[PDB]
Coordinates of C-alpha atoms and ligand atoms in Angstrom, one line a residue:
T1 CA -11.8 153.8 -27.3
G2 CA -9.8 156.7 -28.8
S3 CA -7.5 157.2 -31.5
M4 CA -4.1 156.2 -31.8
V5 CA -5.1 154.7 -27.9
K6 CA -4.1 151.4 -28.4
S7 CA -5.5 149.2 -24.9
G8 CA -5.6 145.4 -24.6
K9 CA -7.3 143.6 -21.0
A10 CA -6.5 140.2 -19.5
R11 CA -6.9 137.7 -16.7
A12 CA -4.6 135.2 -15.9
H13 CA -4.6 132.8 -13.2
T14 CA -2.2 131.8 -10.4
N15 CA -0.4 128.8 -9.9
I16 CA 1.3 126.7 -7.6
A17 CA 4.4 124.8 -7.5
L18 CA 4.1 121.1 -7.5
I19 CA 7.5 121.0 -8.2
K20 CA 9.7 124.3 -7.3
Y21 CA 11.7 126.6 -8.7
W22 CA 14.1 127.8 -5.7
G23 CA 16.7 130.3 -6.4
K24 CA 18.0 131.7 -9.6
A25 CA 21.4 131.3 -11.9
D26 CA 20.0 134.6 -13.8
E27 CA 18.9 137.4 -11.1
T28 CA 18.6 139.8 -14.0
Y29 CA 16.7 137.8 -16.7
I30 CA 15.2 135.7 -14.8
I31 CA 16.6 132.2 -15.5
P32 CA 16.0 129.3 -12.4
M33 CA 18.6 126.6 -11.1
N34 CA 15.5 124.1 -12.2
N35 CA 12.7 123.0 -14.2
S36 CA 9.3 123.5 -11.8
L37 CA 6.2 121.8 -12.4
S38 CA 2.5 123.9 -11.9
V39 CA -0.9 123.5 -11.6
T40 CA -2.5 126.8 -12.5
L41 CA -6.0 127.6 -10.2
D42 CA -9.3 128.0 -11.4
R43 CA -10.7 130.6 -8.6
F44 CA -7.5 132.9 -8.0
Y45 CA -6.8 135.4 -10.7
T46 CA -5.1 139.2 -11.6
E47 CA -7.7 140.8 -14.2
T48 CA -4.9 143.9 -16.0
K49 CA -5.8 146.5 -18.5
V50 CA -3.0 148.3 -20.3
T51 CA -3.7 151.5 -22.1
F52 CA -0.7 153.5 -24.4
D53 CA -1.3 156.7 -25.3
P54 CA 0.7 159.0 -27.0
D55 CA 0.2 161.6 -24.7
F56 CA 1.5 159.6 -21.5
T57 CA 4.4 160.6 -20.9
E58 CA 5.4 158.0 -18.1
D59 CA 4.0 154.9 -17.0
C60 CA 0.8 154.4 -13.9
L61 CA 0.0 151.3 -12.3
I62 CA -3.3 151.8 -10.0
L63 CA -4.1 148.8 -8.4
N64 CA -6.7 147.3 -6.9
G65 CA -8.5 151.1 -7.5
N66 CA -5.1 152.6 -5.3
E67 CA -2.1 154.5 -6.9
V68 CA 0.6 152.4 -5.4
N69 CA 3.9 153.5 -4.1
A70 CA 7.0 154.9 -5.5
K71 CA 8.8 151.9 -5.2
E72 CA 6.1 149.6 -7.5
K73 CA 6.0 152.4 -9.3
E74 CA 9.8 152.2 -10.8
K75 CA 9.2 148.8 -10.2
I76 CA 6.3 148.8 -13.3
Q77 CA 8.6 151.5 -15.2
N78 CA 11.3 149.2 -16.0
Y79 CA 9.2 146.1 -16.4
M80 CA 7.6 149.2 -19.1
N81 CA 10.5 149.5 -20.7
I82 CA 11.4 145.4 -21.8
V83 CA 7.8 145.6 -23.2
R84 CA 8.9 149.0 -25.2
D85 CA 12.1 147.6 -26.7
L86 CA 10.0 144.5 -27.5
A87 CA 7.3 146.6 -29.0
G88 CA 10.0 149.1 -31.1
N89 CA 8.0 151.8 -29.3
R90 CA 8.5 154.7 -27.0
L91 CA 4.9 155.0 -25.4
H92 CA 4.2 154.6 -21.8
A93 CA 1.1 152.9 -20.5
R94 CA -1.7 153.4 -17.9
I95 CA -1.9 150.2 -15.6
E96 CA -4.5 149.3 -14.2
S97 CA -4.9 145.6 -12.4
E98 CA -7.4 144.2 -10.1
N99 CA -6.2 141.4 -8.1
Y100 CA -8.8 138.5 -7.4
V101 CA -6.8 136.5 -5.3
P102 CA -7.1 136.0 -1.5
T103 CA -3.3 138.3 -0.8
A104 CA -4.3 140.1 2.5
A105 CA -5.1 135.7 3.5
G106 CA -1.3 135.5 1.9
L107 CA -1.9 134.1 -1.6
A108 CA 1.3 135.3 -3.7
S109 CA -0.3 137.3 -6.5
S110 CA 3.4 138.5 -8.6
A111 CA 2.2 135.0 -10.8
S112 CA -1.0 136.3 -11.8
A113 CA 0.4 139.5 -12.0
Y114 CA 2.9 139.1 -14.9
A115 CA 1.2 137.1 -17.2
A116 CA -2.0 138.7 -17.2
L117 CA 0.5 142.5 -17.7
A118 CA 2.4 140.2 -20.7
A119 CA -0.6 139.4 -22.0
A120 CA -2.7 142.6 -21.9
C121 CA 0.5 144.1 -23.4
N122 CA 0.4 141.5 -26.2
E123 CA -3.3 142.4 -27.0
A124 CA -2.7 146.0 -27.0
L125 CA 0.5 146.3 -29.5
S126 CA -0.2 143.3 -31.8
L127 CA 3.1 142.7 -30.4
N128 CA 1.3 138.4 -32.2
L129 CA 3.2 137.0 -29.5
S130 CA 3.6 132.8 -29.3
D131 CA 2.5 131.4 -25.9
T132 CA 6.4 130.5 -25.9
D133 CA 7.3 134.7 -26.5
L134 CA 4.8 135.0 -23.9
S135 CA 6.0 132.8 -21.4
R136 CA 9.6 135.0 -21.4
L137 CA 8.0 138.4 -21.3
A138 CA 6.0 137.5 -18.1
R139 CA 9.2 135.3 -16.7
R140 CA 11.6 138.5 -16.7
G141 CA 8.9 140.1 -14.4
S142 CA 8.8 137.2 -12.0
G143 CA 9.6 133.5 -12.7
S144 CA 6.3 131.8 -11.5
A145 CA 4.4 134.3 -13.8
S146 CA 5.9 132.0 -16.4
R147 CA 3.8 129.5 -16.3
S148 CA 0.3 130.6 -15.5
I149 CA 0.5 131.4 -19.5
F150 CA -1.2 127.7 -19.4
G151 CA -3.7 126.3 -18.3
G152 CA -3.8 123.1 -15.8
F153 CA -0.3 121.3 -15.7
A154 CA 2.1 123.3 -16.8
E155 CA 6.7 122.8 -16.9
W156 CA 9.1 125.7 -16.7
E157 CA 11.8 125.1 -18.9
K158 CA 15.3 126.2 -17.5
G159 CA 16.9 126.9 -20.2
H160 CA 20.4 128.5 -20.4
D161 CA 19.4 132.5 -21.5
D162 CA 16.8 134.8 -22.1
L163 CA 15.6 133.1 -25.6
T164 CA 15.5 129.3 -23.8
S165 CA 14.2 130.3 -20.5
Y166 CA 10.1 129.7 -21.5
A167 CA 7.2 126.9 -20.0
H168 CA 5.0 124.8 -21.4
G169 CA 1.4 123.5 -20.9
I170 CA 1.5 119.9 -20.6
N171 CA -1.8 117.4 -21.5
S172 CA -2.6 115.6 -19.1
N173 CA -5.2 113.7 -20.9
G174 CA -8.0 116.3 -18.8
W175 CA -6.6 114.3 -15.2
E176 CA -6.7 118.2 -13.9
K177 CA -10.7 117.8 -14.6
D178 CA -10.0 116.0 -12.0
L179 CA -7.9 118.2 -9.3
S180 CA -8.5 120.2 -6.6
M181 CA -6.5 122.2 -3.7
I182 CA -7.1 123.5 -0.4
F183 CA -5.6 126.5 0.7
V184 CA -5.3 126.4 4.7
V185 CA -4.4 129.8 5.5
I186 CA -2.3 129.8 8.8
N187 CA -0.5 133.2 10.6
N188 CA 2.7 134.0 10.3
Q189 CA 4.3 137.2 11.8
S190 CA 7.5 140.1 11.8
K191 CA 6.8 140.4 8.5
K192 CA 7.4 137.8 5.8
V193 CA 10.9 136.9 3.4
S194 CA 9.6 137.7 -0.3
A195 CA 10.5 134.2 -2.1
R196 CA 12.9 136.4 -4.1
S197 CA 15.8 137.3 -1.2
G198 CA 15.0 134.0 0.4
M199 CA 15.8 132.0 -2.3
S200 CA 18.5 134.7 -3.5
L201 CA 20.2 134.3 0.0
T202 CA 20.3 129.6 -0.4
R203 CA 20.9 129.4 -3.6
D204 CA 24.0 131.5 -2.4
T205 CA 24.4 130.5 0.4
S206 CA 22.7 127.6 1.5
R207 CA 25.1 124.5 2.9
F208 CA 22.3 122.2 1.5
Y209 CA 21.7 123.8 -1.5
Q210 CA 23.3 121.1 -3.4
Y211 CA 21.7 118.2 -2.1
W212 CA 18.5 120.0 -3.4
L213 CA 19.7 120.3 -7.1
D214 CA 21.3 116.1 -7.1
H215 CA 16.9 115.3 -6.2
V216 CA 15.3 117.8 -8.1
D217 CA 15.8 116.5 -11.7
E218 CA 14.6 112.9 -10.8
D219 CA 11.9 114.1 -8.9
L220 CA 9.8 115.8 -11.7
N221 CA 10.9 113.2 -14.3
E222 CA 8.8 111.1 -11.5
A223 CA 6.2 113.8 -11.3
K224 CA 5.6 113.6 -15.2
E225 CA 5.7 109.7 -14.8
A226 CA 2.6 110.4 -13.0
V227 CA 0.9 113.0 -14.6
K228 CA 0.7 111.2 -17.6
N229 CA -0.2 107.5 -15.5
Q230 CA -2.5 109.5 -14.1
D231 CA -1.1 108.1 -10.6
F232 CA -2.8 110.2 -7.8
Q233 CA 0.0 108.9 -4.7
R234 CA 2.3 108.1 -7.2
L235 CA 2.2 112.0 -8.2
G236 CA 1.5 113.5 -4.6
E237 CA 4.5 111.4 -3.0
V238 CA 7.1 113.3 -5.2
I239 CA 5.5 116.4 -5.1
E240 CA 5.3 116.5 -0.9
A241 CA 8.8 114.9 -1.4
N242 CA 10.3 117.4 -3.1
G243 CA 8.6 120.9 -1.0
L244 CA 10.1 119.6 2.3
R245 CA 13.6 118.8 0.9
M246 CA 12.5 122.7 -0.9
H247 CA 12.5 124.3 3.3
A248 CA 15.0 122.2 4.1
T249 CA 18.1 123.8 1.9
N250 CA 17.0 127.0 3.9
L251 CA 17.3 125.7 6.9
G252 CA 20.2 125.3 5.7
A253 CA 21.4 129.0 5.1
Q254 CA 23.8 131.2 6.7
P255 CA 22.0 131.3 9.1
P256 CA 19.0 129.7 9.1
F257 CA 15.3 130.6 8.3
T258 CA 12.1 128.9 7.7
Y259 CA 8.6 129.9 6.1
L260 CA 7.0 127.2 8.5
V261 CA 5.3 127.5 11.5
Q262 CA 4.4 124.8 13.7
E263 CA 0.4 125.8 13.1
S264 CA 2.1 125.1 9.4
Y265 CA 3.4 121.7 10.7
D266 CA -0.3 120.8 12.4
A267 CA -1.9 120.9 9.3
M268 CA 0.0 118.4 7.6
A269 CA -0.8 116.1 10.5
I270 CA -3.9 116.6 9.4
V271 CA -3.0 115.7 5.6
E272 CA -1.6 112.2 6.8
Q273 CA -3.8 111.2 9.2
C274 CA -6.8 112.1 5.8
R275 CA -4.1 109.1 4.2
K276 CA -4.3 106.6 7.0
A277 CA -8.2 107.2 6.7
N278 CA -8.6 106.4 3.3
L279 CA -8.5 110.2 1.6
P280 CA -5.6 110.8 -0.6
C281 CA -4.4 113.8 -0.5
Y282 CA -0.5 115.9 -0.5
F283 CA 0.4 119.2 1.0
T284 CA 2.9 121.7 -0.4
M285 CA 4.1 125.1 0.9
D286 CA 5.9 128.1 -0.9
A287 CA 7.3 131.1 0.5
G288 CA 5.1 130.9 3.8
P289 CA 3.0 129.6 6.7
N290 CA 0.2 128.4 4.4
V291 CA -0.1 125.1 3.4
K292 CA -1.5 124.0 0.3
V293 CA -3.8 119.9 -0.2
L294 CA -4.0 118.7 -3.4
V295 CA -6.2 116.8 -4.0
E296 CA -8.7 114.5 -6.0
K297 CA -11.9 116.9 -6.6
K298 CA -14.0 113.3 -5.3
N299 CA -12.6 113.8 -2.2
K300 CA -12.2 117.9 -1.5
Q301 CA -15.2 118.4 0.5
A302 CA -14.6 115.0 3.1
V303 CA -10.5 116.5 3.7
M304 CA -12.1 119.9 3.8
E305 CA -14.3 118.7 6.7
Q306 CA -11.0 117.2 8.8
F307 CA -10.2 120.8 8.6
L308 CA -13.4 122.5 9.1
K309 CA -12.6 120.6 13.1
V310 CA -9.8 122.2 13.6
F311 CA -8.9 125.4 11.5
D312 CA -12.5 128.1 11.1
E313 CA -14.1 128.0 8.0
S314 CA -12.8 131.5 6.6
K315 CA -9.3 130.4 6.8
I316 CA -9.8 127.0 4.8
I317 CA -10.6 127.6 0.7
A318 CA -11.1 125.2 -2.0
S319 CA -10.3 126.2 -5.6
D320 CA -9.9 123.6 -9.1
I321 CA -7.9 123.0 -11.3
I322 CA -8.6 125.7 -14.6
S323 CA -8.1 123.2 -17.6
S324 CA -7.6 126.6 -20.1
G325 CA -4.4 129.4 -19.9
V326 CA -4.1 133.2 -20.3
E327 CA -7.1 135.2 -21.2
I328 CA -8.4 138.8 -24.0
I329 CA -11.4 140.0 -21.5
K330 CA -12.9 143.2 -21.9
Ligands
AGS1 N1 -1.8 143.1 -10.7 C1 -0.6 143.1 -10.5 N2 -0.1 144.0 -11.7 C2 1.3 144.2 -11.5 N3 2.2 144.2 -10.6 C3 0.9 143.4 -9.5 C4 0.4 142.8 -9.1 N4 -0.1 142.5 -8.3 C5 1.2 142.0 -7.9 N5 1.8 142.7 -8.2 C6 3.4 142.2 -7.8 O1 3.9 141.4 -7.3 C7 4.8 142.1 -5.9 C8 4.4 140.2 -5.1 O2 5.6 139.9 -5.7 P1 5.8 139.2 -4.3 O3 6.9 140.0 -3.2 O4 7.8 137.9 -5.0 O5 5.1 138.3 -3.5 P2 4.0 137.2 -4.5 O6 2.5 138.7 -4.4 O7 3.3 136.5 -3.7 O8 4.1 137.2 -6.2 P3 4.9 135.8 -6.0 O9 5.3 134.8 -4.9 O10 7.0 136.0 -6.7 S1 4.2 134.7 -6.7 C9 4.1 143.2 -5.9 O11 6.3 143.6 -5.7 C10 3.1 143.7 -6.3 O12 4.4 144.7 -6.9
FM0_2 O1 6.5 129.7 -7.1 C1 7.1 128.3 -7.4 O2 8.1 128.1 -8.1 C2 7.7 128.2 -6.3 C3 7.8 129.1 -4.9 O3 6.4 130.1 -4.9 C4 8.2 129.2 -3.5 F1 7.9 129.8 -2.8 C5 8.8 130.3 -5.6 C6 8.9 131.5 -6.1 O4 9.6 132.5 -6.8 P1 8.6 133.6 -7.4 O5 7.7 134.2 -6.9 O6 8.4 133.7 -8.9 O7 10.1 135.0 -7.3 P2 10.8 135.9 -8.3 O8 11.1 134.9 -9.4 O9 11.6 136.4 -8.1 O10 9.5 136.8 -8.7

């Protein structure tokens, strides 16, 4: 609000990978081993304001109304260095961010977080970045954030370097408007292996990683053709298989691990029962036990009702798919 003070605020929505990003070719720049395909969710998002002021001497992150720890403080300061290099300036920022994402329920916040921050910085400093360069900037903070620049279906092109690795939105003739995702919240323990660490151990040591690589391009192609034709069953079958293959890779790591628990398998079983009961739907899982169930909007209520026979109402949470991308807000 004062002169010499530059601020910007953005809202960016989370996204869920249907064809998985799993393993980095370049750990420092976050370049992936394979392309990925995601859908951006309407219900869950991060709002982030950044304020650059010549009088600030270091960057500060206030998250959900509270100061972050020294660890997170260091992480955010290193990311802002990237931003300062891009902008050609030396200004430090006060960052105030709120996650509107059920993180206690295990949903991931890094995709919306880094997409929001990149967009906020772009607005604050008038960088005039293209969506491509916003995607590249967000990517540097978290790989999945590259995709949250966009709404609906989005694809992260792996590229081969910092300049070529980024996402773009896929037009699906408005198909995203007909689809929903139900989150089945499942309890794990022993603290989670972050996606970054897990995928690193797997990419580095898994005896089944080559199997993943040999099939991921075929899956992505199949999925994209399914999107062109708005063929729900065809999309579902391939993404469900792809998700399972990603978890298979962890089983081959040295030593093996899994994100899935018996309750996860219970939820998958319910999805298959829904399919056999003329209620088409398909599941996927990320770096934890939650099961995400892709379903057509017309069937959302019904599928949820099947889950509600078994799971607490608090643990069944649905979202539609949003069509628009990252937003600049007040
Ligand atoms: N609004 C935010 N602004 C800045 N950083 C955030 C924000 N929200 C979450 N983070 C950071 O996101 C990191 C978490 O990412 P992860 O450990 O990979 O798990 P996650 O929260 O599910 O995000 P993913 O899995 O990577 S999409 C935390 O270290 C936070 O510091
Ligand atoms: O989102 C997907 O494609 C699949 C996953 O969510 C499944 F676990 C991986 C997310 O990776 P990410 O959180 O980006 O780790 P980072 O790049 O080290 O920050």
